[PDB]
């Protein structure tokens, strides 16, 4: 009568307890659960928030069930005791972000199941403590990123679920130090390009923005899931055809006007490039390259010093090649 | 070859014609498709925005699909030529939010299926144009209220399907005019209680205030779906119990301070008084009642006229009775 919770149902064999409590109606975590409890069943219940004293001394704890609640809320440092935890079920919740002390501690845990929330964010150290996975469900959430660098130390990491969320782009860095890698689904994400990567993904569900940058993709050997672009004149033809996957070299459509300046004034060059992919405006004193400047493409420094009053050159650049500018300063 | 899109098979029977595009990784509407189809399958897809020329004439549609897809946007008059559409799948997708002129000219829509989408607003009007609807699913969203006016003006609905949102309540008024009612789910929302209504209900995931208030639903004799309670000592017993289920009638723990006042002045009096549920504060001037003041409980009126500087009364009351308590003014 006091190893199990009134509500739940739980059974004993040799040395391990496991404590039954899914589909009980259940609005918070039941104090009596026994802290010798290695499985833990609380799926399909109704949850909302995560107390620190729920969990506190379940060191034999292997798996935790809390899939199908309403849970929003997790005490900080709710999971710090489970150092046993192997797979933790978070999918199909109402969590709206992965916070920095949320998965503290869990050093054995392998499996970490977040699909069907409707998470937005992530802070950046959240996955510092979970280094260990082997599985990462993120599937079915509003994310844009993932703190990639964190990932990266997943080395025995093999499925990273990112399906159905709103991914923009993927870092070059990537899987390189995660070998034993084998599933990376990015079906359904707001994705124009992929990084030129060595090589099972999926990205059926992305509107591709198909330059001879996504070109690499296309020369590989693979079965088609449909993949379609959204480029200039593909706009609707399915991505596996054929390659003419063309860029617009840096074209200078608008350039400052010849001017003499005066001293003692933030002078302010603007330089306007179109291209496909967008060049990358980088500016250029009478002999000597420079290093303030505004993502846009135009320079902006203090006084105008007459030491540097010559030729100034705008460079714009892209893959397919370069285009070149001056501009007056006298 | 022209009154099917390359993208999609469709048959043709009679004078129907289906126009079947479901699971081919489209990214918007194809706009080839004949004005004369009677059923559009395009669940399975991408698509994120809904043009208004997607559907401009499609007179003859009676079904359409746009279940599980990306749509995050539906342009305000989109649906507008379809008066014929009598059911409309918007299911699984990234809908926030619908507008006022969503489902506007949909007059025979009968079933209206937007579960599974982000939902936290709906505009008051939307529902104004749909009053013939049997069925209405709004449920795996995040919602807090449903424009319930709108819906009682649903005249022939069946089905209104709530289940797995936020709902704080539902106003007292509720189904009397819907005749043909047959399921009300309202299981998994913030719910406290429920009105004092004539009569298939479900509602097994709520944070039920159990109060003499909630006593009708008690008294009722219907099945177990493992109803639980959030009321002072009753935090955690299945709501199916002993009925004792009793409120604390309105008590004046703290009143203002007997005070002569003076002319030319917003004198403010506070009530506080507790209860279960909470007392109404209402004011009452020395001979003649008042109907300015504040919802928490307090008096306020300019200039202090000592034509009424007398016996001021106070009047804490809910369903377990009523409490008094005198300030002064001289």
Redesign the interface.
């Known amino acids: 009568f006091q190893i199990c919770p009134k509500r739940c149902v739980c059974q004993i064999l040799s040395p391990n307890l496991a404590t039954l409590c899914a589909?009980?109606?259940?609005?918070?975590v039941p104090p009596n659960i026994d802290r010798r409890t290695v499985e833990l069943r609380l799926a399909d219940n109704?949850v909302?928030n995560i107390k620190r004293k729920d969990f506190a001394n379940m060191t034999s704890l292997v798996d935790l069930t809390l899939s199908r609640n309403?849970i929003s809320f997790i005490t900080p440092h709710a999971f710090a005791d489970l150092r046993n935890l192997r797979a933790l079920h978070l999918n199909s919740n109402?969590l709206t972000k992965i916070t920095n002390d949320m998965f503290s501690g869990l050093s054995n845990l392998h499996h970490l199941i977040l699909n069907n929330n409707?998470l937005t964010l992530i802070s950046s150290t959240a996955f510092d403590d979970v280094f260990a996975l082997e599985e990462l469900d993120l599937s079915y959430n509003?994310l844009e990123t993932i703190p990639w660098d964190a990932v990266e130390k997943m080395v025995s990491l093999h499925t990273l679920s990112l399906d159905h969320n709103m991914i923009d782009n993927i870092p070059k860095g990537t899987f390189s130090h995660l070998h034993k890698m084998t599933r990376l689904d990015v079906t359904?994400n707001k994705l124009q390009k992929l990084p030129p990567d060595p090589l099972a993904l999926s990205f059926?569900?992305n509107?591709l923005h198909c330059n001879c940058e996504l070109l690499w993709l296309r020369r590989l050997s693979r079965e088609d899931?449909?993949?379609?672009c959204?480029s200039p004149a593909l706009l609707?033809g399915?991505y596996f055809w054929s390659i003419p996957f063309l860029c617009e070299p840096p074209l200078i459509t608008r350039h400052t006007h010849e001017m003499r300046v005066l001293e003692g004034q933030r002078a302010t060059l603007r330089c306007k490039a179109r291209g496909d992919p967008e060049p990358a405006i980088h500016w250029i004193s009478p002999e000597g390259k420079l290093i303030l400047v505004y993502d846009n493409g135009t320079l902006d420094i203090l006084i105008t010093t007459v030491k540097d009053t010559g030729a100034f050159t705008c460079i714009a650049s892209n893959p397919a090649g370069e285009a070149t500018q001056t501009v007056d300063l006298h």
């Open positions: 589909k009980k109606g259940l609005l918070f109704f909302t309403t109402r409707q509003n359904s059926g569900g509107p899931d449909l993949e379609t959204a609707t399915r």
